[PDB]
RNA sequence: AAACUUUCAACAACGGAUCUCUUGGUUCUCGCAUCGAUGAAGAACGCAGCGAAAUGCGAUACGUAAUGUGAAUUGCAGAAUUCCGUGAAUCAUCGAAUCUUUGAACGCACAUUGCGCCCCUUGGUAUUCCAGGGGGCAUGCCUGUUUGAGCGUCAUU
RNA sequence: GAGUAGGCAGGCGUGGAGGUCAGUGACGAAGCCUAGACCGUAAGGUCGGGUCGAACGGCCUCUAGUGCAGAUCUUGGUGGUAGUAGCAAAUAUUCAAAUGAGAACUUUGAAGACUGAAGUGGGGAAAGGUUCCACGUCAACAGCAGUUGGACGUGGGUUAGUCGAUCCUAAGAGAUGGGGAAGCUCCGUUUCAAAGGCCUGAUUUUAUGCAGGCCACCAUCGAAAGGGAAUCCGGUUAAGAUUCC
RNA sequence: UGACGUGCAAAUCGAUCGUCGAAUUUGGGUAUAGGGGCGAAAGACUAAUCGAACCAUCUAGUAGCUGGUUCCUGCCGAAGUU
RNA sequence: UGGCGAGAGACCGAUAGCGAACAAGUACAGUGAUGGAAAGAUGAAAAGAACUUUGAAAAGAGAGUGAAAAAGUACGUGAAA
RNA sequence: GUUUGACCUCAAAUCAGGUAGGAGUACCCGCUGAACUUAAGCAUAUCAAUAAGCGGAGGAAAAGAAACCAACCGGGAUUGCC
């Protein structure tokens, strides 16, 4: 009874998609994500999770803003434009 | 090497060449000038642009000449007019030549090339 | 049958069609496709035959 | 397409009239693309819309810099970004202000230059 | 786990020492950094020595009192004797020890 | 942490498989594979090499100097110079001393012209004929070409001679004061062909 | 005292660490008071706290804070330094009078373990420092 | 489920658009290491969410 | 004696070792200090003449503006001699912008593309209802403003 | 002149390193194959023949991630068993034409059957996610087959004032004030809180000040089966319809 | 104590049987989380895992115990006792 | 043992070296936390095989390209079972 | 009992201007905190004032110009190496 026949009754969802993590981790009864800890100020990430930290660290995504911070520094946070010569 | 900011690393030099963008592949795909053109201008070698006429100096196609069609920067080649291979089917396809195995027999002169020639130190246009 | 944006009210489809194509809209019925784009069935009043405005746009 | 150096020499309403014409010109080209096998001319139109919109944004933004010129409290988008930390950081007047006593000491006994 | 006949050793390696071994490969690299650091400081402090005039001082601890050695700073008594100010001394390149 | 990045408990005994840490359950190929071993495909090597290995070696300053002194003494008798390759079968008298003018040579063509006239070109064409490719993996580790060792031009005062000879393939240039053993006896084989200057040969004493 | 937050007093260790009740917090009540105000008013910087009053279940402190954003403080040289972001949450890192006390930052033989920093001192004299020539 | 949330419909819609084999003109290009679409998913083989 | 089994060779298979390479790793050294309410890191969804991705970008969407270079792109198509040029480029540089929906995430919610309110303006005849466009409305705390509360409290009347 | 455990010595072989043989090499390096040869007690070395196509070696020294048959070793590949076990429960198929290279399996016709309205019927819930439908097509999959398909390639398709969601509360979950806690956060949801909203005209100062005055133990989330404003018929598509007409 | 037992199936199949209007059966929602829950009590159940779940980390835990431990030749050559 | 920019090596050389030399924290498993692969080499140049003939077709045998097809996109070499 | 005005303490506002969170974390400042293990057993000890957990910074951080060391013919902030 405990195996194949009991596997047949798995037709609900413990978690759906998280708003922040975007991953089927948002436990819908607790109403908190089991990966990013949403809703919470802090993103769940533990030192004992070496791989898990690496999977969601900086540089996994686009870095829309941080990409160019290196270039902007290098130039001295300059403002305006050059004209011609 | 005495300047420390340059690298004698084979790995770095191979990657820096292969991942060179278009604007620096201009300078990598350079060709030397003819004895006559070097006597005229007084400049050793230039970056091949589109409609320069050249002579082939190495390879199976050695001795043939004409205007360059396509500076195929993405393939590190320059395809020359009249230097083609006819396939079995009877359709012609241009042969990929490296510009350093060619010689610039005739220059394509515009304001930016006159500027380039004067900058290196050519005694004309 | 016009491919409308997402974030576009039936009001905004009616107002858009009237302003652009110069036609009085009797109704607008919108479904979102399995493609994930919206489409809207812009029915006109009896005054305008839809073929006159279909040919005006270009497509036949 | 259209050149942006030509568009900088036009009124507010000439640009608006050029934009609506380009938006109609994309609309009719989007209609032709339905019947035509490959229509790559739509690219130049939608890049020309972006060129005009950028020139309109740039000109309204210059007008708003001119109306807020020579005051405190500029809009936070018009303030120089640099970095949160660099904005927080003490200015050149701050981090340079010294007490009357410590000023008098430096005037009296500055570090001097000697030889041998 | 005890010798044939060997001196009893005290090797203090029962912690995670492997996690805080510090090998000094940086020795040669630091040496040129310190020389460059001195050369640039002498370019900054252009005509003046890198070090200040230290006083002579007899070493403490009777083992070592038999030899004199360059102390930290002169004194308010020695500065007044020599005929200058403890403020003026510090600026024109003399270490002055208030202690 | 190489081969250690996985989580793997052994399955113990009772599964007819041999007791090595095995990978966490999945549909992936990696699941149920050996881990952490030196035997396993993707474990950590037996006693992984660490950076606190003794690289450098201290040797007594007096032993160093003994070796340097004996190496300089071998630059004399030709038996050892010819034993160490070095084509000096034709050359006039051993330890080869030149004028103080060789120190003042600025340009390479005159520096090499000076060396050839003094008696070389047999040992300086060796270093041109020598240039072969390396025999192993060292080619893609910036050790591509071999190039034999030619003469050592030891001087007293530098008036541009080190720059002059720098490019010339095989020739090495040294100051008398320093005088490296690594150059005085390459390969730990005695008797290098050394050209002394007049100033340098007097400064040796 | 600080009651150990272990549930049902069960610690899961060896007798030496079966203590629950008689255990003391290593920071002071001044430090706890500084810490909670630091969290409440995050925009300001804790200059110094001190004792005011106490009963049996309470101790009463008055934390002197400073506004690092107010020009008044940013323009005066004697209190310009506090604005520098290396002084952000002094009370938390333990750089206030209370923290320096609780970290035994004092000169002398008395403070050999904790003078330059207990952790810094421990790792320094548990560091194996090898040279190129041994 | 016939009564989908729009958040599920949007993701079904992206999964539909993604379900195609590699366009057979990209195999023609320079250096092109790519052979076939590796991230191809069927409704039978493997589920999502 | 055939077939059959075993061994060896040649050639052919299966398979992917050996050898050779290597735009990758690794360790060492040196140099530098730059994330975020001016909305970060991360997530979602979109965007090309033909693209599922990786890479790039955000309804201005494999990009816009500026600057440099000086003539391309490339798989095909499509163009274009603007090519003695304010000018090709899947180029470099990057100082002006755009930056959807989210997110510390901030109107209130959120297993919903859910439900409000304030201002300006535009239409329906419209202070109030409905709809379009634009601008807003989180919390703690500091300084200052304004309006207040309390026989807590003073003086005058 | 034996020899396990064991010690020591002399060598053989591998990846690199310094030196040397002005070493070999596209007229063919290395690798691999060889019932051919020679040397060595041996570890091994050398040569001929083939294949192959870009490097490699002798010697004197340095260095080590340096030599495999076993570890129910690791990864990858391969077998014998073996064309074997088997592919046998849900009663059952058969004739003809068509199509096609090919038909037990496809389409149609004709029989014979079964499920027997607590069904093998007709809808839905959760779950799936385009499987729906059309055309083209069969290398892979459907443990036989395949012209067929829930496969493969390219497209088409889901229309709402009335159906649901949206709203309300349920067991409950939860901000707030507050209080605990070193802190992550924990308690509590009406509490030892100063906890905003409602309407009438007003008065017409390009529309703003009144008062008729009232009323207050007070977030929010929580049901696609509970509560609940309102739709029916006929027709329509390849595939939608209480929606389209 | 039938079938199957390298199965249809990591618990099914067939016959026979218990009970069948309540201490009944059951969907959705919700609460209880690991020395904890829950238990009409079998140490039962708590995602095929239960006399203390699962995941990662400390961790390469320790092992007087088992197994393995990779070229040749030469010379010497043991112990099972105190 | 982080981030950015550079130099290096008696290091590793595709079962090695980082888990990742490739659209790698990708595909995929599990409700979840988390677990987590395999996968580089035609040739100088696609010159990627015109055209003929058998077959329904895939393909075959020719012809050709190539320095080699004992290099055919099942692609350097191609061991052993 | 009024007239008006102060003061003190506490409030309100979508009040003028501002600031806090989150990320990262190799190194740094703190808090909290084990067990494996070692002891040939094991409870103090040990691992270790370590891992894990939490709060907080910077290019460095922290420290630091003595309520110091000493006992000398006395040294003289801080940190680092020998
Ligand atoms: Zn999440």
Write the layout of secondary structure elements.
This is part of a larger assembly, with eight protein chains of eight kinds.
Chain B lengths: L9 H9 L3 H7 L1 E3 L2 H7 L3 E3 L5 E4 L8 E6 L7 E9 L5 E6 L4 E5 L4 H10 L5
Antiparallel strand pairs in B: 1-2, 3-4, 3-7, 4-5, 5-6
Chain D lengths: L3 H4 L4 H21 L9 H26 L16 H5 L11 H9 L8
Chain F lengths: L7 E2 L12 E2 L37 H14 L3 H6 L12 E3 L9 H12 L2 H8 L22 E4 L5 H6 L5 E4 L5 H4 L9 E4 H6 L2
Parallel strand pairs in F: 3-6, 4-5, 4-6
Antiparallel strand pairs in F: 1-2
Chain A binds five RNA strands through helix 1, strand 1, strand 2, helix 2 and helix 3.
InterPro entries (chain B): KOW (IPR005824), Rib_uL2_dom2 (IPR014722), Ribosomal_uL24_CS (IPR005825), Ribosomal_uL24_euk/arc (IPR005756), Ribosomal_uL24_KOW (IPR041988), Translation_prot_SH3-like_sf (IPR008991)
Main location (chain B): cytoplasm
Subcellular location (chain B): Cytoplasm
Tell me the number of strands of chain A: 3
Rough outline of chain A: elongated
**Using only CA atoms, what is the Rg of chain D?**
28 Å
By oligomeric state, this entry counts as part of a larger assembly
Report strand % of chain A: 5-15%
Number of helices of chain A: 3
- Give the CA-CA distance, first to last residue of chain A: 85 Å
InterPro entries (chain H): Ribosomal_eL39, Ribosomal_eL39_CS, Ribosomal_eL39_dom_sf
Family (chain H): Belongs to the eukaryotic ribosomal protein eL39 family.
Region (Disordered) (chain H): 1-21
GO biological process, one term (chain H): cytoplasmic translation
């Amino acid at each position: 009874g405990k195996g194949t026949p009991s596997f047949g009754k798995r037709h609900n969802k413990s978690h759906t998609l998280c708003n922040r993590c975007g991953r089927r981790s948002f436990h819908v009864q607790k109403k908190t994500c089991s990966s990013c800890g949403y809703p919470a100020a802090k993103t769940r990430s533990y030192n004992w999770g070496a791989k898990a930290k690496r999977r969601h660290t900086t540089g996994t995504g686009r870095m829309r803003y941080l990409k160019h911070v290196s270039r902007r520094f290098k130039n001295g946070f300059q403002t305006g434009s050059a004209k011609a010569q | 090497k005495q300047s420390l900011d340059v690298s004698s690393d084979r790995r770095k030099a191979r990657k820096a060449y292969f991942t060179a963008p278009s604007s620096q592949r201009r300078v990598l795909l350079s060709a030397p000038l003819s004895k006559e053109l070097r006597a005229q201008y007084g400049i050793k070698a230039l970056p091949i642009r589109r409609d320069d006429e050249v002579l082939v100096v190495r390879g199976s196609k050695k001795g043939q000449e004409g205007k360059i069609s396509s500076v195929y920067r993405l393939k590190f080649a320059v395809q020359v007019d009249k230097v083609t291979k006819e396939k079995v089917n009877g359709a012609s396809v241009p042969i990929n030549l490296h510009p350093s195995k060619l010689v610039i027999t005739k220059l394509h002169l515009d304001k930016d090339r006159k500027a380039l020639i004067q900058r290196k130190g050519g005694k004309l246009e | 049958v016009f491919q409308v944006s997402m974030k576009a009210n039936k009001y905004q489809i009616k107002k858009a069609v009237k302003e652009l194509y110069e036609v009085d809209v009797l109704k607008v019925n919108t479904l979102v496709r399995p493609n994930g784009t919206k489409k809207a069935y812009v029915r006109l009043t009896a005054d305008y035959d839809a073929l006159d405005i279909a040919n005006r746009i270009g497509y036949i | 397409g259209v050149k942006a150096y030509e568009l900088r020499t036009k009124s507010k309403e000439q640009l608006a009239s050029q934009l609506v014409d380009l938006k109609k010109e994309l609309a009719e080209l989007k209609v032709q693309k339905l019947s035509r096998p490959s229509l790559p001319k739509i690219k130049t139109v939608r890049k020309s819309i972006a060129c005009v919109l950028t020139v309109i944004n740039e000109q309204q933004r210059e007008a708003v810099r001119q109306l807020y010129k020579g005051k405190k409290y500029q809009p936070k988008d018009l303030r120089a970004k640099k970095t949160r930390a660099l904005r927080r950081a003490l200015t050149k007047f701050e981090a340079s202000q010294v007490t009357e006593k410590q000023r008098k000491k430096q005037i009296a006994f500055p570090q001097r230059k000697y030889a041998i | 786990a005890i010798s044939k006949n060997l001196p009893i050793l005290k090797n203090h390696f029962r912690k995670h020492w492997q996690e805080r071994v510090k090998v000094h490969f940086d020795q040669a690299g630091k040496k040129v950094s310190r020389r460059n650091a001195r050369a640039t400081r002498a370019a900054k402090i252009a005509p003046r020595p890198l070090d200040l005039l230290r006083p002579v001082v007899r070493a403490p601890t009777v083992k070592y009192n038999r030899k004199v050695r360059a102390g930290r700073g002169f004194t308010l008594a020695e500065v007044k004797a020599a005929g200058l100010t403890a403020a003026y001394a510090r600026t024109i390149g003399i270490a002055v020890d208030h202690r | 942490k190489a081969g250690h990045q996985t989580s793997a408990e052994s399955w113990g005994t009772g599964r007819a498989v041999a007791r090595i840490p095995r990978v966490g359950g999945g549909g992936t190929g990696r699941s149920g594979q050996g881990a952490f071993g030196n035997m396993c495909r993707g474990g950590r090597m037996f006693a992984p090499t660490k950076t606190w290995r003794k690289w450098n070696v201290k040797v007594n300053h007096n032993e160093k100097r003994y070796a340097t002194a004996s190496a300089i003494a071998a630059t004399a008798v030709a038996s050892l110079v010819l034993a160490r390759g070095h084509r000096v079968e034709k050359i006039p008298e051993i330890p080869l001393v030149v004028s103080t003018d060789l120190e003042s040579i600025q340009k390479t063509k005159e520096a090499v012209a000076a060396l050839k006239a003094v008696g070389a070109h047999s040992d300086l064409l060796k270093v041109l004929k020598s240039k072969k490719l390396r025999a192993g993996k060292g080619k893609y580790r910036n050790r591509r070409w071999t190039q034999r060792r030619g003469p050592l031009v030891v001087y007293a005062e530098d008036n541009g001679i080190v720059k002059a000879l720098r490019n010339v393939p095989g020739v090495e240039t040294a100051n008398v004061a320093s005088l490296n053993l690594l150059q005085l006896a390459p390969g730990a084989h005695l008797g290098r062909f050394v050209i002394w200057t007049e100033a340098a040969f007097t400064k040796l004493d | 005292n600080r009651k150990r937050p272990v549930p049902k007093g069960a610690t899961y260790g060896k007798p030496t660490n079966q203590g629950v009740n008689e255990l003391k917090y290593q920071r002071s009540l001044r430090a706890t008071a500084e810490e909670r105000v630091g969290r409440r008013a995050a925009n300001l910087r804790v200059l110094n706290s001190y004792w005011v009053n106490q009963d049996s279940t309470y101790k009463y402190f008055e934390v002197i804070l400073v506004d690092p954003q107010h020009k008044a403080i940013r323009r005066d040289a004697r209190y310009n330094w506090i604005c520098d972001p290396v002084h952000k949450h002094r009370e938390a890192r333990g750089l206030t009078a209370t923290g320096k006390k609780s970290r035994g930052i004092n000169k002398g033989h008395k403070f050999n373990n904790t003078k330059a920093g207990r952790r810094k001192t421990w790792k320094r004299q548990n560091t194996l420092s090898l040279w190129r020539y041994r | 489920a016939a009564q989908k949330s729009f958040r599920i419909k949007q993701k079904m819609a992206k999964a539909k658009k993604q379900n195609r084999p590699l366009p057979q003109w990209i195999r023609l290009r320079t250096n092109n290491t790519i052979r076939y679409n590796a991230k191809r998913r069927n409704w039978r083989r493997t589920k999502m969410n």
